Design a protein around this nucleic acid. Structure first.
Lengths: 46, 55, 110, 102
RNA sequence: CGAAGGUGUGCUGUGAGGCAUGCUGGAGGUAUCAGAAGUGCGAAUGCUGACAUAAGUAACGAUAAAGCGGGUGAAAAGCCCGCUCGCCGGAAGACCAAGGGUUCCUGUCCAACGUUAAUCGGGGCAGGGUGAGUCGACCCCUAAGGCGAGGCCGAAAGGCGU
RNA sequence: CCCGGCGAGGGGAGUGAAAAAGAACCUGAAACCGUGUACGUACAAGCAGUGGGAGCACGCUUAGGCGUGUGACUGCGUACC
């Protein structure tokens, strides 16, 4: 039976990558929150 | 179907009162080599009833 | 003079090892070895090794004679358990216990 | 500066070797010293085929706390304390019982 | 010349309690009179950890299937070699993209992992292995769509477009 | 040094004030699981105790008692919130 997750690297990076986060004002707020919490990984980009 | 009350250790033991093992009564002695073996079986060196069968 | 030998953290259940331990309580050592050699159980091998270790200790460290020894005490106690996971139907998980035992044998010339 | 230095002669103040004398061999950074013939221990040493070294039970010195030793004064034959002062343009140590330079 | 804490025994008050002492332990305890409270647990299908019962009971994952001789080893139904038997064959054969990332080859080990044993493994440890002018990517060109100097519009944030 | 698979695990020797301080290492409670000893139990019906009460084993002893463990037989008796 076909399930929900079906991977694709190009789509992953175009959806949740560093440059996509930087291109909008709310994405920068996501980055600021995560830097303030002190995460070791900031985005999904390798 | 499941229990309504927890059984006791006394009941556990009463049920297990039939679980003991039995030992072998005695062994046999070959008439030529002198080894001990299970009756009607061959010995560990290859004898049965005084004759060498397996080399 | 009594001599001890032990096997700690053995891979078996104490309930299973006691069935074999009960066969040789109070026997002479030669008779006990003969009994253990013709028992078709896995616990028999382990118990036999422990008995042989006890006899060798009594010969080397205490200067005993083989023909005078008897199995004066023997017992099994429970040890730590390992915990594992086993999946079942419809995304439900169950726990598995892997049990161990300690085995103790005491020989004496009295 | 430091009151106890390498190549000094000292006397032991506390422990199983209370009263013995010896020479300081080297000074460690944790606050301990190795003195010659003092505080011996028996080590069970495993053989190692490399280096052609066999095993055996060895006797060797162990480190002792520096505040448990004292500088020895040969003139008096007793333990002493140390002080510092300037004499020409350089710093020196002196015994406190008689005020003589070391 | 043995503190708190742990485990027994004797005595004592109407009760919550108190006093003495044997064994274990190895460095702290605290009279009397006053002062302050995170001050007393059996229940809330209470919260976290440990351990029972059912029980040595159910089960061991497609009914394609195995037999025998020799080798190694502490130990061989399951590993290596040989001879027979059986199963698929528009696949249960061969080569790729997507996805994964050392699982590939050689030596050595059997605690844990393998729903059983294991000398075996896609397991543990160490060493080796990917060679391009012509195969691909990068590069030149554009589709749907995206961004967008000036520009139009909108309390701010922003929206649409050359 | 010894048994064992050139294992796992253990017994000696030795260190140390101490090894039931041995690396799964200060103290080491309770639930839960065993080995040994004394007494009871295979014609007997229920909240398992309480009142009465033989017999057996064992320790003192003023040889008179007494203490502690077990408990056949018998009156009464349907948990807690």
């Amino acid at each position: 039976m076909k399930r929900t997750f079906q991977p694709s690297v190009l789509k992953r990076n175009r959806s949740h990558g560093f440059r996509a986060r930087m291109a909008t004002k709310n994405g920068r707020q996501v980055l600021a929150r995560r830097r303030a919490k002190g995460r070791a990984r900031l985005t999904v980009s390798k | 179907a499941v229990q309504q009350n927890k059984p006791t250790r006394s009941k556990r033991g009463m049920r297990r009162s039939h679980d003991a093992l039995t030992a072998v009564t005695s062994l046999s002695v070959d008439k030529t080599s002198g080894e001990k073996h299970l009756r009607h079986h061959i010995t560990a060196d290859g004898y049965y009833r005084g004759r060498k069968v397996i080399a | 003079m009594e001599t001890i030998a032990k096997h700690r953290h053995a891979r078996s259940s104490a309930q299973k090892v006691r069935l074999v331990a009960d066969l040789i309580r109070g026997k002479k050592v030669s008779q006990a070895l003969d009994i253990l050699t013709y028992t078709n159980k896995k616990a028999a091998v382990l118990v036999k090794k422990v008995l042989e270790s006890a006899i060798a200790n009594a010969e080397h460290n205490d200067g005993a004679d083989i023909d005078d020894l008897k199995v004066t005490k023997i017992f099994v106690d429970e040890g730590p358990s390992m915990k594992r996971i086993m999946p079942r139907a419809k995304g439900r998980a169950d726990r598995i216990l892997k049990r161990t035992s300690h085995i103790t044998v005491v020989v004496s010339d009295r | 500066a430091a009151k106890i230095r390498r190549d000094d002669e000292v006397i032991v103040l506390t422990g199983k070797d209370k009263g013995k004398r010896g020479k300081v061999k080297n000074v460690l950074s944790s606050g301990k010293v190795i003195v010659e013939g003092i505080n011996l221990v028996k080590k069970h040493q495993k053989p190692v085929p490399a280096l052609n070294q066999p095993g055996g039970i060895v006797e060797k010195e162990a480190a002792i706390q520096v505040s448990n030793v004292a500088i020895f004064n040969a003139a008096t034959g007793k333990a002493d304390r140390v002080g510092f002062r300037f004499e020409d343009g350089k710093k020196v140590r002196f015994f406190k019982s008689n005020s003589e330079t070391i």
